[PDB]
From a paper:
However, no structures of [name] containing AEBP2L are currently available, as all previous studies used either AEBP2S or its partial sequence, without its N-terminus. Therefore, we solved the high-resolution cryo-electron microscopy (Cryo-EM) structure of [name] in a complex with the full-length AEBP2L. We were able to solve the structure at a resolution of 3.6 Å, which to our knowledge is the highest resolution of a [name]–[name] obtained to date. Yet, we were unable to identify electron density for the N-terminal region of AEBP2L, consistent with its predicted disorder propensity. Importantly, we observed no structural changes to the catalytic lobe of [name] or to the DNA- and [name]-binding domains of AEBP2L compared to the conformation of AEBP2S within the context of the [name]–AEBP2S–JARID2 complex and the partial [name]-[name] complex that was determined using X-ray crystallography. These results imply that the N-terminus of AEBP2L is flexible and highly dynamic and strongly indicate that its presence does not affect the structure of the rest of [name]. The N-terminus displays a distinctively strong negative charge (in red), in contrast to the positively charged DNA- and nucleosome-binding regions closer to the C-terminus (in blue). We identified two sequences of 10–15 amino acids each within the N-terminal region of AEBP2L, composed entirely of glutamic (Glu, E) and aspartic acids (Asp, D). AEBP2S has been shown to enhance [name] HMTase activity in vitro, and the KR motif present in both short and long [name] isoforms is responsible for enhanced nucleosome binding and HMTase stimulation. This, combined with our binding assays, the Cryo-EM structure, and the histone methyltransferase assays that were carried out on nucleosomal substrates, DNA-free histones and histone tail peptides, all collectively point to the same inhibitory mechanism: the AEBP2L N-terminal region interferes with the DNA-binding activity of the [name]-[name] complex.
Polycomb repressive complex 2 ([name]) is a multiprotein chromatin repressor complex responsible for mono-, di- and tri-methylation of H3K27 (H3K27me1/2/3). Core [name] contains one of two catalytic subunits: EZH1 or [name], together with [name] and [name]. The recruitment of [name] to chromatin is mediated by accessory subunits. [name] is an accessory subunit of [name], and its exact function remains elusive.
Residue numbers in the entry:
A (entry chain E): 80 to 441
B (entry chain B): 83 to 147, 154 to 167, 182 to 217, 228 to 256, 295 to 322, 351 to 363, 423 to 545, 556 to 685
C (entry chain D): 14 to 19, 22 to 72, 80 to 123, 168 to 181, 219 to 229, 234 to 247, 259 to 305, 317 to 340, ...
D (entry chain A): 3 to 92, 112 to 412
E (entry chain C): 392 to 499
């Protein structure tokens, strides 16, 4: 846990940024490239040696006023082009191809702002959207169709704030303002049938509009872990990591300790907690923590501009001490951090449109 | 001063290009409008005497009322080989995107350096096909300096007279080439536009001429015509008249409610980019009838701007009741995405039934099957119940035989009879049907 | 050293190390599971090739650098335009209303159990008792399926009761939703070789009574309890019995208004103290009142329609009872198509095809697809039927999709309802509301106040609607 | 490439703004505007010659013949009813009465002048179908199998030109893209039989034939226009199935439409691809009497007026329907009046945003024009009175 | 409510770019009174008739809008520049001024 900052950039509009996403879809050897969304613009950069960050691209939306919130990186199987998905307050989800330097798709089917975008780890053509409409949506980005809508009689009731796929792509966790954490399953026959039907829907084939899937009942819901806002959850193997306004990250698992995750009955009413990670100065919400692709370390932003880095090695809830890498320039706040495909560099975003970088030394 | 230019940045650029397009490619003739008729001067006093045969008469009377030319060069005063070609252009056909070109050569001799070479052209060009060719031209190409010279005019009348001429040359004080060619055979008003922004005035101007539309430079005559033109043809603005006694004053404000919506197919708006606005192809449309003008009244001729639609059918894009996705016109058919039995209700019924602990599955299964049946058909009147029962043994009986749950089914029938809803005969017949089917 | 010891430390450390080992093992295993899936994902990644990103070939954006790097300038490609839709919180489809309504001390006492006797009971008390934990030291079914393998003979009460206690007569469903819960259990030729009579003496003994088996006998019991000495029926219904066997077995064993409640008087007239008569509530068909309850309601005898002010079931706000109004036809067409009656529209339910679209005033709007007349029927305002206090609390937290059913309930369409829920507010409306008593429960009918053509909008007035 | 797409996007936004500007200024240029969106676009339109007058009311009734052009659907020949307010106008309703089934798009519809119950249509195939809306149900049978009373066999490819013969009976001419003109005597052998044979075939043209029209006074005179840039005048009695009687190089490009003058026997007009509307006279077809040049693109339909004699209207793919005036040729103009346009241009109608497939005059209500476009927009409109009228 | 206006900032930006370029070249609203274009004359050829006289040619500087004309020697002056109203330009050639002056949208 030893990084040496080598660069620090500042934008021009000085409006806060929210998203950083390394492109993990680059062949080994291709240059490291990442994206960053802000007030109403996006930015595309490449990382170079000696702490050099070279500007590559930037777009802007002038037709209205909106706040972009997140971003997502995938690829197109047909022609091998990179694809970037962005989402903002207007509820529109925009899919853009950097190769053609043009927006290629837009999806508008929500009722409020979008908060998180994630894709299926195996399927590159399933897009998951989390919104302020209390419901989660899942689209097929190829056939221009929806697949399933999560939410309803027994679902979230207030402001779903985040969701996360498991390491394999058949279980999803969701968390919102109503202090509730809910589990959705994708391995059911229902979901694969809907997916397989979604991969074949020609509008010029039948007079019937496509039939979506409504899921009104989660696999397991609870409000006992925290007692306040929960804004970020993460799959760590078969364990769950989550955060609240209680300045402490918690790792736990559903059911009892001996219980498995593929035998949990839907009417479960007991949760086994495992451990806690301590830090300070997280009194406001909307800060996300990130983990490396190899699942070997953890990074988390801070309001006073500091950092907190742990390791997912043999050591775990014991302590792992608390590595803090800080600099004297920006102490505004930090929204999201990101690692490259390997552990080379770590990027963080400060609240005043200032981007940072920390290279990995020994 | 930066603020108001930012404000009027959006309409002004559109209106400039619209000015140009309207002047070159008009929408409507401005002399045909009612409030600008003074622009036109002639009167319809000849649609009573005009006889179409007299057109032939007069036109015929008025309109009723080869050579192998040689050219000799004198030398090219440059500071080198040259040839002369006849280059002509053919009329555009529907097949041919643009006007095609054809060049025919002559192959003359070269010329001395800064001081023989001559040509004798002929009737190779055909004036008969005036329906094919547009115009011809003589060319002086090749470097080591190019020039061109048209020969015939619009109505194929050659203008190149007989004589000796000196023409220049250009690549791809200058090179020159002389030759010779011979055929061988009331007071001004003070209207002050006053632009407004941020609820306070920020600029004024002055058009001392009687008036011109500052965006399009159309010259109408009177003040009422000016207000009429400004208010309608520039709807993106909000003009406003007050009566400044010496002259006239006009104000400006950006319209917060301007119908800038798309006014075409209400399906093209939500189409993935690239597939939006295809144009080429037939598309189903939702019937819509309008009446914009039915019978107007030519009320007075002035004293209105300063002194002081019908509908039908469908004119909107409809949406699915559950996904907030657009609804196709084809899908706008008898399908109504609504029925008596939602799936979440059925699943919740099953889950709530299973929630009980002091009940046996031999009862829970019967309860679930009957509940699903009743929810599926929705019986209301008591007299329906008996028919319900037989329908039930007609419908779910197979499944019950798969479970052999008939004994509890008889018990449920007896309990139903306890509520005065079934008779002995109905119970007996249902039991017979179940036995026979089993 | 009794209170000082309260033993605590030993089991505290025991639980400590046990929990530590359990979490260590679980976490190490979880890491092991992470490894294989991550390896599979990496091997998946190793078979892909993706093009790189290239710098572009009119406002320009700039980015500087605090740590000694020159300012960089790149142009700014403007993005395309996308339409938008009005805000919409989630909802669910509904067609009919949906009613809605120390540990260380335990470780220590267990340890004491593991380990005159009062000396080990008053020590932990100073736990908290020398008797409660003394009691701790001392300390340290349903009727099955008749179809099932295990069962037993039992009286009529058991299974008939299990059925009786979960069947809403008003509803025709088991444990259904919109009806409140209460417990009110309501009460020749010969056969062949082994006919029931089979002799004069057996018939005489049967008349006197009128004055080998297993669990099925209980069923037999209940059957007899409602069949009253059948000749063929009992042996017939039961699997493989014979009438003589049934006879012998019998001989051997014998050796505005509040919601309409039913006027179920045990022994009293429908008139005087009736709970549904102190509030004018007409005693509908579900009363246990006398069959000649004068507080009951007759039916219309009209033939063509009940729409006019002639129908008795139309003046007193009511929808034609499908068991009493036989001439209008509310009972005809059991669940079939169009009925001549016009005051029988809500019961079956005949919604006119509605379409959703962005409104012309605020938010969303609902538009009727086909023309209607001045007093036709369109839809019902469904949702959640809640109590008045909950209505107040929900109104407080929301601050309003609320409506007033009666003086005892409130209809909310905030989370459940149908398409008619939007009906943007106005002062000049196109529709209107009329609360109707259908069958036994209150309902809401949204009629048209005027003529509506193909493609208008409905503006039901909320002002006088609470 | 991308340049073309950007040009199209800019052009579409500009056209939308222009259509809004036109919408604002409707009540200063017309006295009646009626816009309707058909379910499918129509490639034909012709006012039927019968009009009903509902007494004690404020709306007459007229009938129109339309068609459908759709992909992956059924096809119909549509007989529609329209309401127009009377002299003391206010009052609007357009409906589809008869919807018989077709096979392929309706490229042309032309009723028989003698009996308003015969509608011959030209199929995207080679055959010429002849229906009769009376002897058919009021709705298409769900089978979708046509049953045209007759079916006239002929050329080997589709066409766009169909024309009956007034002052006679049963003589229908057709033009196809196989450089031939076909004649049929439907009057003879009048029955429900399915095959009739072409009486004669004319092969004068050497290019795709685009239109053919009989004479309105002379019985045996008809003119043909094709992609050959010529106008070709025939006469049936003379045995000249190949050679014409008058060949005229009309235009420098393709010609698509001819139209004889109802009130004369010498005047005829042409509308060509060279963006000009020429004039001709049968007495000497070598002096182009006049050219009308305002259109920005191809010219497809040129039709005279049923009531007035000097009013000619021509349309094309420039989304305009310029209405001309013969009596105004050569008049002296004021400066600004000259800046606007030539004196002949009396009106320009910019209500359509797509190529105008067809338009037609009303014969029982003067100065009423019905025009359809490829954007499914059909407009029935009448220009303002003060334009053609006077003090 | 506010309809999403059809003129997105993209097409307006393109119009602004083409407008600044065209007005940088064609000089309207600055050297012309908003309703005109100005052309400058260039002498390309000199011609001598057999009888005593000289007729020059003038190739207008912007060119591809106007055709060439034989002009007398004296009349070179007063014809150095020519200002033409927009409505009087040759219609067949006027479409070269801008791509979106006229366009046949239903292409193919």
């Amino acid at each position: 846990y030893s990084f040496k900052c080598v660069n620090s950039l500042k934008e021009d509009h000085n409006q806060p940024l929210f998203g950083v996403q390394f492109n993990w879809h680059s062949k080994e050897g291709d240059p490291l490239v990442f994206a960053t969304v802000g007030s109403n613009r996006v930015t595309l950069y490449e990382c170079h040696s000696q702490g050099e960050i070279r500007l590559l691209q930037s777009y802007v939306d002038a037709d209205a006023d909106e706040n972009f919130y997140t971003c997502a990186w995938t690829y197109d199987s047909n022609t091998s082009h990179p694809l970037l998905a962005v989402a903002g307050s207007r509820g529109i989800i925009r899919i853009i191809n950097p190769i053609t330097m043009q927006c290629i798709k837009h999806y508008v089917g929500h009722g409020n702002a979008i908060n998180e975008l994630k894709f299926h780890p195996r399927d590159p053509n399933l897009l998951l959207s989390v919104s302020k409409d209390h419901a989660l949506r899942l689209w097929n980005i190829q056939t221009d169709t929806l697949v399933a809508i999560f939410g309803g009689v027994e679902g979230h009731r207030d402001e779903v704030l985040s969701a996360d796929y498991d390491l394999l792509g058949e279980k999803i966790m969701s968390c919102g303002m109503d202090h509730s954490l809910k589990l959705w399953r994708i391995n059911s026959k229902r979901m694969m049938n809907a997916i397989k039907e979604s991969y074949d829907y020609n509008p010029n084939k039948t007079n019937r509009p496509f039939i979506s899937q409504k899921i009104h009942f989660p696999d397991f819901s609870t409000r006992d872990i925290h007692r306040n806002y929960v804004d970020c959850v993460r799959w760590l193997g078969d364990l769950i990591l989550s955060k609240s306004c209680e300045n402490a990250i918690v790792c736990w698992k559903p059911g009892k300790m001996e219980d498995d995750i593929d035998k949990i009955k839907p009417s479960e009413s007991n949760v086994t907690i495992l451990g806690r990670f301590d830090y300070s100065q997280c009194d406001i919400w909307y800060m996300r923590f990130s983990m490396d692709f190899w699942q070997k370390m953890l990074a988390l932003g801070n309001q006073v501009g500091k950092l907190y880095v742990w390791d997912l090695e043999v050591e775990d809830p014991h302590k792992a001490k608390c590595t803090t890498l800080t600099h004297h320039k920006c102490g505004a706040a930090i929204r999201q951090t990101s690692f490259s495909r390997d552990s080379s560099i770590l990027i963080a975003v400060c609240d005043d449109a200032s981007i940072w970088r920390w290279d990995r030394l020994r | 001063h930066e603020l108001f230019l930012q404000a009027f940045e959006k309409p002004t650029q559109i209106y400039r290009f619209l000015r140009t397009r309207n002047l070159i490619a008009p929408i409507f003739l401005h002399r045909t409008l009612t409030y600008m008729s003074h622009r036109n001067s002639r009167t319809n006093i000849k649609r009573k005497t005009f006889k179409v045969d007299d057109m032939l008469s007069k036109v015929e009377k008025m309109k009723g009322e080869s050579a192998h030319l040689q050219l000799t060069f004198t030398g090219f005063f440059h500071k080198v080989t040259l040839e002369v070609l006849l280059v002509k252009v053919c009329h555009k056909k529907r097949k041919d995107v643009s006007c095609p070109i054809r060049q025919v050569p002559t192959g003359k001799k070269q010329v001395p350096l800064n001081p023989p070479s001559l040509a004798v052209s002929s009737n190779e060009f055909e004036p008969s096909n005036s329906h094919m060719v547009k115009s011809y031209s003589l060319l002086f190409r090749v470097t080591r300096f190019v020039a061109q010279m048209t020969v015939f005019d619009k109505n194929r009348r050659l203008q190149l007279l007989d004589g000796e001429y000196e023409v220049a040359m250009q690549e791809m004080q200058g090179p020159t080439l002389q030759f010779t060619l011979r055929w061988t055979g009331r007071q001004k008003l003070r209207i002050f536009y006053q632009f407004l922004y941020n609820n306070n005035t920020r600029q004024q101007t002055e058009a001392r001429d009687d008036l011109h539309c500052p965006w399009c430079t159309l010259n109408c005559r009177k003040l009422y015509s000016l207000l009429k033109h400004l208010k309608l043809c520039h709807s993106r603005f909000i003009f406003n008249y007050v009566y400044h006694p010496k002259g006239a004053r006009i104000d400006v404000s950006i319209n917060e409610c301007y119908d800038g919506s798309y006014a075409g197919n209400p399906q093209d708006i939500h189409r993935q980019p690239g597939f939006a606005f295809s144009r080429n192809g037939p598309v189903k449309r939702t019937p819509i009838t309008h009446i914009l003008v039915c019978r107007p009244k030519r009320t007075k001729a002035s004293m209105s701007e300063f002194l002081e639609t019908y509908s039908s059918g469908h004119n909107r894009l409809y949406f699915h009741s559950d996904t907030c996705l657009p609804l196709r016109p084809q899908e706008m058919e008898v399908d109504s995405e609504d029925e008596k039995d939602p799936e979440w209700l059925r699943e919740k019924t099953i889950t709530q039934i299973e929630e009980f602990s002091d009940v046996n599955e031999g009862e829970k299964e019967v309860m679930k099957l009957w509940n699903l049946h009743v929810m599926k058909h929705g019986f209301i009147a008591d007299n329906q119940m008996n028919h319900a029962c037989m329908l039930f043994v007609e419908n779910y009986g197979q499944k019950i035989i798969k479970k052999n749950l008939c004994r509890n089914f008889m018990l449920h029938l007896v309990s139903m009879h306890d509520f005065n809803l079934i008779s002995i005969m109905s119970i007996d017949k249902a039991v017979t049907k179940l036995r026979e089917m089993q | 050293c009794w209170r000082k010891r309260v033993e605590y430390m030993r089991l505290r450390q025991l639980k400590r190390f046990r929990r530590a080992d359990e979490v260590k093992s679980m976490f190490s295993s979880n890491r092991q599971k992470i490894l294989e899936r991550t390896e599979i994902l990496n091997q998946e990644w190793k078979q892909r090739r993706i093009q790189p990103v290239h710098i572009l070939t009119t406002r320009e954006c700039s980015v500087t650098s605090d740590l000694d790097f020159p300012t960089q300038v790149i142009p700014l490609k403007t993005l395309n335009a996308v339409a938008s839709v009005p805000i919409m919180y989630s909802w669910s489809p509904l067609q009919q209303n949906f009613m809605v309504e120390d540990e260380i001390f335990v470780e220590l006492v267990n340890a004491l159990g593991q380990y005159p006797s009062d000396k080990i009971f008053e020590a932990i008390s100073s736990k908290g008792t020398a008797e409660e934990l003394k009691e701790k030291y001392k300390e340290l079914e349903c009727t099955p399926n008749i179809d099932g393998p295990n069962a037993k003979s039992v009286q009529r009460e058991q299974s008939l009761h299990s059925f009786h206690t979960l069947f809403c007569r008003r509803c025709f469903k088991y444990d259904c939703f919109l009806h409140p819960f209460h417990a009110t259990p309501n009460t020749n030729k010969p056969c062949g070789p082994q006919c029931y009579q089979h002799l004069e003496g057996a018939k005489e003994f049967a008349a006197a009574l009128t004055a080998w088996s297993g669990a099925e006998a209980s069923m037999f019991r209940v059957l007899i309890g409602t069949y009253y000495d059948n000749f063929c029926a009992i042996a017939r219904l039961i699997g493989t019995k014979t009438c003589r066997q049934v006879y012998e077995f019998r001989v051997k064993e014998s050796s505005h208004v509040y919601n309409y409640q039913p006027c179920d008087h045990p022994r009293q007239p429908c008139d005087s103290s009736c709970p549904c008569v102190i509030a004018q509530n007409f005693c509908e068909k579900f009363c246990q009142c006398s069959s000649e309850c004068q507080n009951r309601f007759p039916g219309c005898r009209c033939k063509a329609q009940c729409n006019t002010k002639q129908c008795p079931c139309y003046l007193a706000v009511r929808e034609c009872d499908p068991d009493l109004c036989l001439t209008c036809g509310a009972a005809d067409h059991w669940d079939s198509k169009n009925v001549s009656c016009k005051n029988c529209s809500i019961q079956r339910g005949s919604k006119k095809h509605l379409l959703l679209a962005p409104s012309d005033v605020a938010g969303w709007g609902i538009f009727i697809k086909d023309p209607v007349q001045k007093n036709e029927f369109i839809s019902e305002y469904c949702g959640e039927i809640i109590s008045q206090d909950e209505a107040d609390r929900r109104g407080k937290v929301y601050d309003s999709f609320l409506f007033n059913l009666n003086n005892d309930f409130v209809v909310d369409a905030t989370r459940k309802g149908n398409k008619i829920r939007f009906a943007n507010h106005s002062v000049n409306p196109n529709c209107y509301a009329k609360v109707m008593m259908v069958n036994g429960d209150h309902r809401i009918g949204i009629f048209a106040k005027r003529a509506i053509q193909t493609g208008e909008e409905l503006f039901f007035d909320y002002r006088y609607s609470q | 490439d991308k340049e073309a797409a950007f040009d199209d996007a800019v052009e579409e936004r500009v056209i939308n703004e222009e259509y809004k500007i036109w919408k604002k200024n409707t009540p200063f240029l017309y006295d009646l505007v009626m816009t309707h969106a058909l379910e499918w676009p129509s490639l034909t339109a012709q006012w039927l010659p019968d009009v009903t007058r509902p007494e004690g009311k404020d709306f007459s009734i007229h009938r129109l013949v339309l068609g459908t052009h759709t992909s992956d659907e059924q096809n119909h020949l549509v007989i529609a009813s329209v309401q127009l307010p009377n002299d003391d106008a206010q009052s609007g309703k357009i409906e589809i009465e008869i919807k018989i089934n077709h096979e392929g798009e309706v490229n042309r519809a032309r009723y028989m002048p003698q009996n308003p119950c015969i509608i011959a249509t030209k199929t995207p195939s080679s055959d010429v179908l002849v229906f009769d809306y009376t002897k058919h149900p009021s709705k298409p049978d769900p089978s979708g199998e046509c049953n045209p009373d007759l079916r006239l066999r002929g050329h080997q490819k589709e066409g766009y030109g169909l024309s009956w013969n007034p002052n006679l009976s049963g003589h229908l001419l057709s033009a196809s893209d196989d450089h031939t003109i076909c004649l049929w005597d439907i009057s003879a052998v009048p029955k429900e039989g399915k095959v009739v044979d072409a009486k004669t075939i004319f092969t004068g043209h050497t290019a795709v034939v685009e239109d053919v029209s009989w004479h309105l006074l002379h019985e045996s005179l008809f003119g043909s226009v094709a992609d050959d840039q010529k106008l070709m005048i025939w006469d049936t009695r003379s045995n000249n199935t190949s050679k014409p009687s008058h060949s005229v190089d009309a235009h420098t490009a393709e010609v698509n439409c001819l139209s004889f003058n109802p009130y004369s026997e010498f005047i005829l007009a042409t509308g060509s691809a060279d963006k000009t509307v020429a004039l001709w006279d049968l007495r000497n077809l070598k002096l182009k009497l006049h050219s009308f040049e305002s259109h920005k693109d191809e010219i497809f339909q040129v039709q005279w007026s049923p009531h007035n004699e000097t009013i000619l209207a021509s349309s094309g793919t420039d989304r305009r329907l310029n209405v001309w005036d013969l009596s105004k040729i050569g008049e002296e103009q004021s400066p600004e009046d000259a800046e606007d346009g030539p004196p002949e241009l009396l009106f320009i109608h910019g209500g359509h945003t797509a190529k105008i497939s067809d338009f037609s005059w009303n014969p029982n209500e003067p100065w009423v024009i019905c025009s359809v476009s490829e954007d499914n927009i059909m407009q029935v409109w009448q220009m303002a009175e003060n334009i053609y009228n006077d003090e | 409510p506010r309809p999403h206006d059809f003129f997105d900032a993209q097409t307006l930006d393109a119009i602004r770019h083409r407008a600044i370029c065209f007005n940088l070249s064609a000089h309207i609203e600055s050297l012309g009174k908003g309703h005109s274009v100005v052309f400058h004359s260039t002498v390309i050829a000199k011609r001598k008739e057999d009888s005593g006289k000289i007729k020059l040619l003038l190739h207008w500087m912007p060119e591809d809008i106007l055709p060439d004309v034989w002009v007398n020697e004296s009349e070179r002056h007063q014809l150095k520049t020519k200002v033409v109203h927009l409505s009087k330009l040759p219609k067949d050639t006027a479409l070269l001024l801008d791509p979106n002056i006229y366009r046949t949208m239903p292409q193919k």
